[PDB]
Amino acid sequence: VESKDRKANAHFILKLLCDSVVLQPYLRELLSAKDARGMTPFMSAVSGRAYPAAITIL
Amino acid sequence: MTSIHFVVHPLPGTEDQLNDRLREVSEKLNKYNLNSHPPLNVLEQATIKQCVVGPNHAAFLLEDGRVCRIGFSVQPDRLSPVSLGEDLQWWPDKDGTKFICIGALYSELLAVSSKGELYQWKWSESEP
Amino acid sequence: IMAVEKQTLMQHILRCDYEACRQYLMNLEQAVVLEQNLQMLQTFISHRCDGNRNILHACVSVCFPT
């Protein structure tokens, strides 16, 4: 609900998707797929000011 | 599975209002995630092939040769607040109608059979 | 009228449900231990959003500065 709580939950979810041992073989494609703007998740993170998200993704 | 949701948009206008209404329904799907109306609740657990919206009714088709229909009621003072009909009217199945395609017309719904039979029943009445 | 789809983790991420996301991951990994949820997971991972956005795109897009 709160902005700080929302950001904390988002960071927790990103870390959860990072440390999911189940999705290891698919992450290689999950972080390599492109959106409609022709960019990876990392590029979208860095353009949308999601700088901590970009660091964790990298 | 799926969730049934409707939107209303004044006919003369640009596309920005439609896009804004779609954004509102998206936010409700995300910020609110309100449940769908009970009459279509059953059709939540069934697939859909094609849907048709008539002058006052709307018919929805399952992939298993089954159809359903329902009207609505829209409040203009308050302007999914639109509330559909109380009981969803079905299409009784006899000798394997096996619907494939449908069609929307002002005075009646149109349905197809596997062999091809232009079944139709008026919106006003309740008999094929 | 519309019938919006139902992709559970997509909704959880786009709504930022940390508890629900963790529960979904736990159930998925338990089922993978059961070895009966490999193909279904492979099909599910390709559940998308508007604009060919995979789950990670939703994750980052629900993380933009307020």
Task: Kindly give the interhelix angle for A3-18 and C18-33, rounded to the nearest 10 degrees.
Answer: 20
Q: Does C60 lie at the interface with A, CB-CB under 8 angstroms?
A: yes
The amino acid at residue A48 is G
Task: Note the resolution in Å, 1 decimal.
Answer: 3.5
Give chain A's end-to-end CA distance (angstroms, integer).
28
Of residues B75, B49, B76, the one with CA closest to residue B63? B49
Of A10, A22, A35, the CB nearest to C57: A35
Touching check for B3 and chain C: CB below 8 Å? yes
What's the CA gap between B92 and A25, in Å, rounded?
Answer: 50
Question: How is residue B36 written in tokens?
Answer: 């769908």
Distances (CA, A) of B66 to A10, B27, B49, B125: 43, 32, 10, 19
Q: Which helix (H) or strand (E) holds B41?
A: helix B38-41
Spatial neighbors of A49 by CB under 8 A, at least 6 apart, are C64, C65
Contacts of B29-32 spanning 24+ positions with Cβ under 8 A: B29/B3, B29/B5, B29/C4, B29/C11, B30/C11, B30/C14, B30/C15, B31/C15
Backbone φ, ψ for residue B120 (5° rounding): -155, 145
Sequence-distant (6+) residues with CB within 8 A of A53 are: A10, A11, A14, A45, C59, C60, C63
Q: B3-5 and C2-4: which strand pairing?
A: antiparallel
CB contact, 8 Å: A58 with chain C? no
Provide the experimental method for this PDB entry: cryo-EM
Number of H helices, E strands in chain A: 4, 0
> Nearest residue on chain C to B52, judged by CA atoms?
C1
DSSP category for residue B8 = -
Breaks in chain B, after residue numbers (C to N greater than 2.5 Å): 79
C29 close to A (CB below 8 A) = yes
Which chains form contacts with chain C, at 3 or more CB pairs under 8 Å? Answer: A, B
The helix or strand, by DSSP H or E, that contains position B121, with its residue range, turns out to be: strand B119-122
